[PDB]
Design a protein around this ligand. Structure first.
Ligand code: HEM
Ligand code: HEM
Ligand code: HEM
Ligand code: KT1
Ligand code: KT1
Ligand code: KT1
Ligand code: KT1
Ligand code: KT1
Ligand code: KT1
Ligand code: KT1
Ligand code: FE2
Ligand code: FE2
Lengths: 155, 155, 156, 156, 156, 155, 156
């Protein structure tokens, strides 16, 4: 079914953001595991899987709309050097992603691509859940102190 | 995550309506139970619980958006003194609630808070199902007569 | 069964305290959840549910006694801005509640409404258990430190 | 254990009321069953059984206190001639019974027989629940009409 | 169905005997339990329950025959002051009861109320089984001695 | 929670009575078992356990009320030299215990410590049941004779 | 079986130590529970129970040996005012207890009461396990710090 060219460009932009996130979150996960912070590692792993599932849905939608899904271009990964930076890097990436999601929804609404809008809204709900997790972790580091926060994520 | 100030004000207005509904429905339920109309009492209790769940979701959303959920200001309860009046009081409250939900959704759309809009759309679906229930009960009173209607809600 | 007018007034005062506590505890619960302190959030949630069940019993008793349960007036919520203050706000509310419960029981006894007395005694038992909980949490914060206390309430 | 003479006298007065209630409710039950109002007949049978259980407990307490339980004297049954009157008869009996229970509890408290008071308070709670049932049934007769009310109690 | 007036009068006389027995056996039961003779107390409780079941059936039959079941008049209880006397009291009551049952059956047969006769015969069989139990217990007291007999009824 | 000083003194006096009863019942139990009267031994053992459970509740209440539970002072044990005396010693102890319970309940009521009253009433109900048991055993000894009574408590 | 008089005196001395320990550990348990240190409270409760079981075996042995078990004399409880002091009070008691156990075993061996020796040796094994627990707890406070040690004992 022939989709709106600009819808497909927006979907490819969102996909590009998900592809960055997949890799950034997977590397952060394996860094935490290597450091022995296995609870952070497992949770970041699951965040990476979630972004993989969103990427799948975006790829499927673009193909249905007779576009070419862009898996070739990979933007800049934001990799932290300690737990605090890694969480902040994830959050900065998520805030860019939700800005881009909002602009894409605006355009889907204007051209009546209501199914693409519904998909983007579901993804946005997932990303806002991830923002909530990240903001809460950074707040916990303040409330319990960094040593305790790391301790609580060892096992 | 920093929410739109007026979105938060709208969410607090909806929360205010839910808080009224919780108490109005809880009292109507216990009145109906006291009167021996336990099928009305039990159905109205479930309506109160549903409003409790909507309030919970609004409180959670407001806190995520870095606002203050107002659980202090309670508006006017519409308490009836007989079965038909209590149903009409619930209906009047629900029609006010859905008007407010539509205005809040408009503003959520205008500032691109699509997750808040989706939460409110879900609440609106629940309130319209309650409106359907209430209009149907009021119609049943007309069709089967008040005495039969009450008889059918004793057990 | 028409009850004593002042008994019903006492029951509505107790109910009014329970209504404040429902909302105060529910907001504190959701604040703690928002902050990542989910074990505190869950325990405070269950305190709010407990007060909802007390409010229900009071409403039922007032209706049986042919009075009007007051769900319209809501007194001042005591909302804290950090964990220690939130617990202390809950404790201050509970100490007001148990004083009111004692005065109500005295009056029930005087007018021989022994069933209302028994209901209030059961509610008083629950509120003293909550006071025990709150005083103990406040003591634990002093013994293990706030950072450790909060750490121990991160995961449910 | 040697109980207070006036406590035992109060306990025997409460027992006397329960013995009336047992017989009154059992006959009402079987009248309703004979008339085809089997839901009323079954509910009233369970009220009779409950009064039998209360009488058992009173008998047991009187004997522990070294009194003689009075099962010989039977006061006046209040038997109605139609469903409304039968429910009202039960209610009139319960209102007398709860008055007597309150006076007995007063005296138990004065002479420090706290266990007898506790037993009487538990009975008082059951009797107030019965009064609630009866008042509600009589209100329903007015709200749904006598014909509908009886229709709703034909089948169990 | 309109029953024979004198049949109903006989049925009310049998019902009166059962109402005595219910109360007599229930009190004896609770006396034995208070004294620590719990096997006697339990057996006598089950005798009381059986008389309650017979009274139910008589009440139901009287109402079917369009009579008024008499639950207001209660004859003289025979309460013993020790185990032997209590058993003898039950026996004296049962021998009066079976005499009355026979006279009632005679009249049912004369006026062709065969269903009432059948109900009374079933009750008569239960009462003769009770007489057998009682006579046997009294014989055992003589054969094993009072002290042994009571010893054998301490534990259930 | 700061308790009434005289309530706490009453609670410590009741606790004192329970501590005597724990030890008196436990010794009587083990004496009966040593004599081969194991049904008496077992029943008296369960009486001792019950008093232990009451003592626990009293200790917990005293600490909640910010008092010091007195586990140091132990009053006079009433130990019998035969079964009849042992039962009578238990009964003498229980009759003192229930008198003290009533005086403590009076004071709880006067100072509106309704929860302490409720605890004491529950303990009083248990002690009255123990009195019933003991009075009944002593009556059975007279009805069946000592040799049969003891025989019935061998196995 | 007529036991050695001095064995019985030693058994009564060990019993006296156990009676102190029962009460001291029970009170420490309930203090920790009140303070919200429930893992410590539960563990100390089980220590108190273990001492109850030892006391029972000693009482039973003394009676078999035809002695009088002394449950009247209760020595000085060592009650701490904070966690470190309570642990050290428990340890001081246990060290006195095991010294007395060794002296009692020596005497049992000398008079050939090998079964009493075996009983005391089993108790000594239990008390040495308690000493290991206590010394380890005090060492952990030094290694992880008091605040962390207490944190780790908040939740069962
Ligand atoms: C801020 C206002 C309130 C909120 C946010 C709230 C929230 C809730 C929630 C989330 C539940 C659990 C529902 C479920 O998933 O099963 C609940 C249950 C309940 N609520 Fe409320 N509630 C509020 C006020 C009240 C009031 C005023 C009453 C009664 C006067 C009440 C009575 C109850 C009862 C009886 C239950 C069922 C508890 C049980 O037995 O499990 N609630 N409430
Ligand atoms: C002193 C008077 C009475 C006493 C103490 C008494 C006591 C009791 C008790 C304790 C029960 C058992 C209830 C339970 O735990 O489930 C019972 C059952 C019953 N009683 Fe009575 N009752 C009395 C009078 C009567 C009378 C006058 C009748 C009939 C007219 C009656 C009919 C019954 C019946 C039908 C049952 C149910 C038996 C079953 O389990 O099927 N009772 N009674
Ligand atoms: C002579 C002194 C005591 C002796 C010989 C003794 C003996 C015993 C024994 C044998 C048990 C059962 C243990 C098992 O489960 O196998 C027990 C349980 C118990 N004891 Fe003691 N005890 C004594 C004093 C105390 C005291 C002073 C208290 C409280 C202050 C106490 C509180 C308890 C409790 C709470 C239980 C558990 C009961 C249950 O719920 O099963 N004991 N005791
Ligand atoms: C998937 O598109 C199709 C749909 C069709 O119906 C028929 C053919 C095609 C493939 C056309 C060549 N595609 C390339 C080539 C290089 C890199 C990329 C892609 C791409 O599609 N995404 C990349 O990253
Ligand atoms: C959710 O509040 C917070 C979030 C935070 O992250 C930090 C602090 C606060 C507390 C600030 C005082 N809040 C009050 C005070 C009084 C009444 C109400 C409230 C409210 O929020 N709703 C009411 O009904
Ligand atoms: C005796 O009735 C009245 C006397 C008056 O002077 C004025 C109005 C009424 C009936 C008003 C119906 N009941 C209401 C109404 C609103 C709120 C509540 C209730 C209630 O019962 N609990 C509430 O919170
Ligand atoms: C509880 O009776 C006892 C307890 C004892 O420990 C020793 C003896 C007795 C029986 C004394 C004669 N009792 C009668 C006699 C006739 C009617 C009644 C009663 C009665 O007790 N209630 C009645 O309705
Ligand atoms: C079976 O009664 C009825 C059947 C009907 O179909 C209609 C009406 C009646 C009630 C007439 C008044 N009955 C009383 C009154 C007082 C005492 C007794 C009774 C009684 O019946 N037995 C008593 O001990
Ligand atoms: C529960 O006591 C406390 C509560 C606190 O919050 C803080 C400290 C304490 C310990 C104070 C010393 N207590 C002793 C000393 C010796 C004997 C006894 C006791 C006792 O309490 N009962 C006895 O039998
Ligand atoms: C176990 O005693 C016996 C064994 C028998 O075979 C025969 C009689 C007796 C009782 C002799 C008086 N006993 C008392 C008296 C007071 C305190 C204590 C005791 C005691 O034994 N331990 C105490 O703490
Ligand atoms: Fe109808
Ligand atoms: Fe830590």
């Amino acid at each position: 079914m022939k989709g709106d060219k600009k819808v497909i460009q927006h979907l490819n932009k969102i996909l590009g953001n998900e592809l960055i996130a997949i890799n950034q979150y997977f590397l952060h996960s394996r860094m935490w595991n290597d450091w022995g912070l296995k609870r952070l590692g497992a949770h970041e792993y699951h965040e990476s899987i979630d972004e993989m599932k969103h990427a799948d849905k975006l790829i499927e939608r673009i193909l249905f709309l007779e576009g070419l899904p862009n898996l070739q271009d990979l933007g800049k990964l934001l990799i932290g050097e300690n737990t605090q930076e890694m969480l902040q890097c994830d959050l900065n990436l998520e805030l860019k992603a939700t800005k881009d999601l909002r602009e894409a929804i605006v355009h889907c609404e204007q051209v009546h691509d209501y199914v693409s809008r519904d998909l983007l809204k579901d993804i946005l709900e997932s990303e806002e859940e991830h923002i909530d997790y990240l903001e809460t972790q950074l707040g916990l580091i303040q409330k319990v102190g960094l040593e305790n926060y790391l301790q609580s994520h060892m096992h």
